[PDB]
Every structure is written in structure tokens, then in C-alpha cells.
């Protein structure tokens, strides 16, 4: 059960999350919970760790900038983090809020949430499952989601590669700064597109 | 004259380059020479340094991989360079061949050639002139070159930003590895697109 990792039941957790997140975002988290279970089954990852990590990945999405800055200082995190914003913070910093609120100490689940947005050059299969589940969950309808889903049915690594390439492409298209760890992920995984 | 920087006249140089480079590439170099002069006039950069740097920027485009690897070892350059290829090498390593062949020791011209492909987080106006001239020279006809030309008529910094964003976008679109120094340039200049 989820209580093997956190300080409350799944239902109690959902009730807490319904207070923290808008409807669309909680619906998304439920979608990632389901998608992570499916991917974990397919690729030999613990389905319970994957489900929980999926449900929790965006738990800190609505923390204020000020709250994130306080956490960077309190946990003496990479000071370069202050130069970024919610997109980077909600996973990379938000894990500390999740830990405080839920008594989540499982290193694998924490890592998968930590890097769910930006990836890393080295990712566990659990990390990859969450990173991909976030992109392909059933509520997503962006053009090309069908391609992502097809790739994810066949190769976890190729799905990471595809998502990362689309993210870098899109950020450059929009003229948004690209977190350097995102490029580490991109360069490590891009060979899978061949 | 060019002899103030290199060991031969401009005509002698053109004759040497016509032996090293295919026609299309030499035509390109002549185009960059002209475009760099125009940009240097516009943005207060020495027109002669810009012209020469522009003519020379792709001098090493046809060196073999083996030749580049030999240069990395001989000059004890960043060993990570061996993980890349001609796109990175012809500027970043090719400067040493240019120096050997032409007795080019001007630090500013060398730097502008060195980073003409990948940029840097900090670029001199001369570096920026070459980086942009390469992209907008009259023989180029890629879709969107008109936009690049318009931006370059107004802002050197915005032209660097635009070119860098299009390069990152394209590399991710194609599924090619992105040299990390390219991301340094991108992140440093992307604010100019606003
Ligand atoms: Fe997220
Ligand atoms: Fe999400
Ligand atoms: Fe070049
Ligand atoms: Fe060129």
C-alpha cells in the first residue's frame, strides 16, 4: 500500500491533493499514476513505486516562488536554482515539500519525482517511467502524443529520447531558456532515435 | 592589408583556398567576407579584422577526422572534443591549422573563427559579426534567411539570439547531439528575442 512509503492512505492523499491543486492538475496526476503503472508493468519496474511516484510528481506544482526560494536556502541546494522558476523547481525542489508533508524518504521515488521535468544523463528505469508517463497520460492531447504513445509501447529509452528532443525543440521554438540538465538528458538519449 | 595579420596577400590566400575547398564552400567564404564587412561597418567592429575572419572562418572545413584528432593531441585541447566531429572541429580545432598555414596569431581573429559555429556565453562584437555573417551571407537561401537579415540590420545581439535558437531548434528537430557550448550561447542570448 502507499502507507509503506508515505504517512497516509491513498484516499487521504487524494483529499490533501484536491486542496493543493486545481482540478485539471489533479486529473493529470491521476492520469500519470495510471500511465506509470502501465509502463512499469511493460518495462519491469515496481508498479507500486511507479504508481505513487506518478501520482505525486506534480504535488508541488502550485507552491509560490517565495516558497521555492525558502526551500533552496533551507536545504542548501544548488544556488544556481534561484535563476530559474517553477518548471525546474516543482520537481527539483518540490521533493523537499513532498518529503516534509508526507514523510517520503524512499530514495528511488524521490529521485524519479526530482528529475521528472529535466531528466538526467543517467536515469533509473523508474525515473524513465515517470518522465514518459507524464507526457503520454490519457488526458494529454497535444499533436504528436500518438507518436509518443506508440514509441512508449516499444522502447522506454526511445520514448525518453523522443520526449526530450521534442522538449528541447519546443523550448528553442518558443525562445525559452533551456535548463542545462535537460541538455545532459538530451545528449545521453538522442542516439535512440536512430 | 591582410598581410598585417597573415603571411600572404589576399589573392595568394584565395589561390591557396581554391585548392583546399570545393567551389561552393569558397563562394560561401567570399560571401561571409562581404557580409562581415557590412555588419562590422554597422556595429563598430574593425572592418579588416571582420573581413579576414569572415574569409577564413571555414578554411579547415575539409580537414579529415584523422587530421583533427592529431591536432587535438598535439595542442592538448579539451579531450572531450574527440567525442564530436567536423561541425565542432572545423572552428574549434581548425584555428590551429589556420595558424600553422598562415602564421595567424591575432587573438581576436582566432577567437572569432574558433567559436563561429558554437558561439560562447561571452562573445566580442567581432565574434558576433562572424557568427551572424556566416548565417546571412548572400549565397544563403534557407527559408527564414530574410528574417535573419532583417534582425541583423537592427541588432547584432538579437541576430545572435535568433540564429542560436534556430540552430538548437533544428538540431533537436533532426535528432542530432547539441554541443554544450551551443547551449551556453543560447541561454546567454535568448533574452534578446523578447
Ligand atoms: Fe511536472
Ligand atoms: Fe506532470
Ligand atoms: Fe563553419
Ligand atoms: Fe560558414
From TrEMBL, chains A, B:
Amino acids binding dTMP: 87, 179, 182
EC annotation from Swiss-Prot or TrEMBL: 3.6.1.41
Positions of the HD domain: 25-139
Protein name: bis(5'-nucleosyl)-tetraphosphatase (symmetrical)
Cited Pfam families: HD
Protein residues bound to ADP: 25, 61, 140, 179, 182
Superkingdom per UniProt: Bacteria
Amino acid at each position: 500500500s502507499y502507507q509503506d512509503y508515505i504517512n497516509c492512505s491513498r484516499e487521504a492523499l487524494l483529499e490533501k491533493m484536491a486542496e493543493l491543486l486545481p482540478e485539471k492538475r489533479l486529473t493529470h496526476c491521476l492520469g500519470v499514476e495510471r500511465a506509470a503503472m502501465e509502463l512499469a508493468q511493460r518495462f519491469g519496474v515496481d508498479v507500486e513505486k511507479a504508481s505513487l511516484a506518478g501520482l505525486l510528481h506534480d504535488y508541488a506544482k502550485k507552491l509560490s516562488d517565495q516558497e521555492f526560494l525558502v526551500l533552496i536556502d533551507r536545504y542548501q541546494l544548488d544556488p544556481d536554482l534561484k535563476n530559474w522558476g517553477n518548471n525546474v523547481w516543482h520537481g527539483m525542489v518540490g521533493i523537499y515539500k513532498i518529503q516534509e508533508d508526507l514523510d517520503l524518504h524512499d530514495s528511488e521515488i524521490l529521485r524519479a519525482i526530482e528529475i521528472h521535468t529535466v531528466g538526467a544523463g543517467q536515469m533509473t528505469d523508474l525515473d524513465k517511467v515517470i518522465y514518459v508517463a507524464d507526457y503520454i497520460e490519457h488526458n494529454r492531447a497535444f499533436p504528436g502524443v500518438d507518436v509518443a504513445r506508440e514509441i512508449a509501447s516499444l522502447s522506454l529509452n526511445k520514448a525518453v529520447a523522443y520526449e526530450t528532443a521534442r522538449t528541447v525543440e519546443y523550448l528553442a521554438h518558443q525562445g525559452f531558456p533551456i535548463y542545462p540538465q535537460t541538455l545532459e538528458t538530451y545528449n545521453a538519449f538522442v542516439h535512440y532515435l536512430k
